[PDB]
Every structure is written in C-alpha cells, then in structure tokens.
Protein: cis-3-hydroxy-L-proline dehydratase
Amino acid sequence: EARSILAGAAEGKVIATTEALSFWGGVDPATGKVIDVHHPLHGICLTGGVLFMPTSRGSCTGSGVLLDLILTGRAPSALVFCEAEDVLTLGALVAAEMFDKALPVIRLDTETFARFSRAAHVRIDQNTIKADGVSLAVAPPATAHLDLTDDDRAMLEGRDGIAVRQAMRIIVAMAAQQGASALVDVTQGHIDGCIYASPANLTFAEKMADMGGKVRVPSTMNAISVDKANWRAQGVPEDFGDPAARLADAYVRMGCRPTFTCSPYLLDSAPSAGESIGWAESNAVIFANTVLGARTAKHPDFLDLCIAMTGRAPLSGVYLEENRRPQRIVDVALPAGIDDAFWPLVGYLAGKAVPDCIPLLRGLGAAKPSRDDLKALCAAFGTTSASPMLHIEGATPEAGLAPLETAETVTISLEDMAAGWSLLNEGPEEVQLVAIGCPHASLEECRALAAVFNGRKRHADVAVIVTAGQQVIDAAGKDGTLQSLKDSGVQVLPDLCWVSISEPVFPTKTRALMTNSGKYAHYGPGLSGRAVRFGSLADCVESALTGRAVSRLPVWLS
Ligand code: FES
Ligand code: NA
Structure:
C-alpha cells in the first residue's frame, strides 16, 4: 500500500535509512546536510533527494527546519515514511497552507518501504510513485471524519479572525492524517518555535502575529536563542540576535508568557495528572506525560501556537488512555553503585531500543530516581525516539497500565550501557568548557552543583556555564546558590539552552566540552563543531577544577 499524506510531485535520488532523524540538530538548514554525528546519513546532503526513513525522532523544531529548507530550495524533494509521523509532516503542511510550497509526503507499508529504499531513483505525482520503474498506486489523503463542535466550525469559518481560522485549518488537517475523530480542549500551552533555528521560524511567527494571532489559553514559552536582556552586551552578532530577539518578541505579543525555559514543568503553572495540555518541546512533552501524568501529544513547532490560539488539539495519540498503555517492554539492567549519569544514559538507550512506540522500563523501581534524574532521562529519551511518553515500573504514576497484548520484550544490558557510554564520549580528555542545564537546570540541580564545587573555584582555562530558567535564577539569588556558583567562577545564563546557544556566548576558544546532559551529548558535536564528552555531575565539576575529563567507564560499569 501507498498512502498520500500531503499531495505533490517530486523526483530525485533515493536517500534511505532505517534510523529516524531529527531535522533540528540533525540537518543543517544552511546547507541541507545531515549533521547528526551518530546517524548513518551523516555528511549526506539531502537537497533534491527523496528521503526514505521510517519516521522522525527528536526535536519538535524539525518542522521549522524543514519549512526553511523548503523556502530556500535546499529541502529534500519528498519524504517517504513507513509509520506515523508528525513533525516533518506538519512542517510541509505549513509550507502548503501558508507558503506555497508543496512537498509530497507518502506513508508506505513496511515491506514496500524496504523494497523502495534499496532503489536508486524515485518519482512521485498525485497518482503514482515509481521506484526505478515499479509504479505503485498512491491512495488519496485520508478524509477528515471529525466531530466539529459549533465553536470549532465557527473558528473554521473565520468568526474569530483569519489567524484563528488558519490555526484551525492546520489542526483539522493534522487530526485527519492522525485518523482522529474529534478535537480535545487543552487547558494551557507551551510554545517551542520561539527558538531561532532558522529564518522561517521568525517568518511564521510574524505572519501569524500580523494576521491578529493571540493565544486563548495560558501559554508559556520554551528556550530562546538569545539571552533576551543581555545579548547585545554579550557581543552576539546583530545579524543573529536581532531576528532571534524579534522571534521571542512575536510570541510575547501574541500573549505568551515570557518564561523562556525548556523546563516549564518546574514552574508554578505546571500541570497535574490527567490534565489535557498542548505542549511542544520534546523533553517537556515526555516529562509531562511520563512523570506528571498529564496528557499531551508531542506537538511540532507551529502546531503548538495553533493549539494555543484555539484551545483545541487533535484527540489522538496519548490524549487517549488506550494509547498510553505500554507498547513494548524493556528489561533494564540495574548495576550496583549507579549515580546521576545512569539515568540520561538509560533514557538515551531506551529510545534507541524503542524508537517508535511507548516503552515500559522494568527493573529500576528500587533505584528511586529523583525528579532531576527523570528529567535527564526523558530529555535523553527524546533525542533517540519519536514517542511522547514512557513508563518506568515503580517510579511513574501510570506504569501499572496493562501493556498492550502486542507488546514485545527487549533488554538493555550492561554491554549496551558500556557501548552507549563510549558512543557519547568521542572526544579528548582536555576540555575548555563544562555545559550544564540541558534541559534548563532546576534549583535542586544548581544547589547540587554548588555542593559538589565545595567552595573551590574552576580552572582558569575551563569555562563553566549553566543554563536555567529565569525563575530558577531568581530563586538561586535568594537562597545564596547563585553567588556561590559565581564564587566558583560559574556563569548562570537565562533564556538560552545549549541547543540554542551560539558564539561568542559559547566561548570560541572551545575545542572540547563536557556535559552531564545525554541530550546535549548527542546533539552537541553537530551543533557546535566541538568534541563532546559525557559524564556525571561530579565528572563535570572535576573537569572544571582540573581542566580535564578522565576517559574511563563509570563505577557502575567497571
Ligand atoms: S531547548 Fe530543548 S532541552 Fe533546552
Ligand atoms: Na530531541
């Protein structure tokens, strides 16, 4: 079978892979080249080709990256998946709805996906897809068999303005390709497209704001690409900082709260269990479903604003209880003597083992991970998987849900962990930067960082930078944690995250960095061009003191 998701026609090289790719962090919008150093397609330029991959993974920001690639002509000619997909499909949907450029997206059956992937040339139209001259019928897009309340139809008819109508059109089209049957109310939103990942990110926000866009539910804002109050004094180039600040300005104007944080679940406004929200940012989505028991799909950038403007989201995916049941079982080895570095590594490896469905992690309940531990795990899980949630037996409030009767069992062994640890430590021992706070550090994290520092001060050659939300930095000033960190030579930066940081705030002298973030360990090398080392919090501080990160497997892997 061949299903048309978004109509259109294309032709070019078959660029095929069996592993999902995040377009934000994995594809350079300036060149169209794969920059994920851990992906098989690394170094390949995707422009003009027909990309064959099972689905997407990682960042909600891939929609803005694809939209920019479409606007500059550097995009692939088309996208072929073999499973459900939202992020790239939404990006191509925004391109057709608001920007003229039709990129075709087709979902295949698995075996015709494997057959067509080993091909050399592929062509598409509204009718057919050819793999060297093996024409196959493409079934038309799925009919929207959706409920629309009277207020839904009224918004869709333009009774709340053109911006609200354009939001509803995108939501209804996304609901149609997701096979939904209705929309669902959301109580709050979290906008992720406020990162300046590409010029198109700003173009979309200004176009929605100039059409009258305003959010209907309380909506927070994710990390942005400037220290909003200080980027001019920091020497950030005007060519970058001005549109980056204007992008954040556009969403504040549309009524979003200027929280500028990728850990909104740490704010006083965090949702509770059973609450239906509309969140983007993959780590926050995963944390909201996994840890808090709230409900939100992993909404791509741009769709988050649409949901916030309407207060409505497609009733599909993990909004429904049946779709929250574990879809695969993962038996994780529990070695003795685990520290904080265990949890991001497990999340990273769990996503590689379960990249396309919801896992239940077994064998870890007695370990009692902190909220920060689960925070690091969910963030790392997001980088290697597409799923919006996971379960941890004996840790997360919904882990008792009956696994689906299709659920298979896989393992994460000690050998799996040693390979992953080495995978994330492809760098030297000399480091000039310690990167903490991806996602944004909690107050407990900043206090734990100061406790490990024990009043010492960093090596002069090693910068130590912590990214956190403004509200955490405000609280760290009250209880004295901030001054203690600055006593040790640590810089605490608001608004920015390591995903969005750039020179010169990212010190240009840096050749290698160490981080305690599994997420940034994966994305860091391609985003920064530097070598990246991964370790525990104390491994980071020791690197900060000595200038050096000892190349070694951890205590619990020896
Ligand atoms: S912006 Fe995604 S984790 Fe900080
Ligand atoms: Na991600």
Observations:
- Residues 47 and 213 are 33 Å apart (CA to CA).
- Residues 2-137 form a domain with the Glucose Oxidase; domain 1 fold (CATH 3.50.30.10).
- The first strand starts at residue 2 and ends at 6.
- The chain has 18 helices and 22 strands.
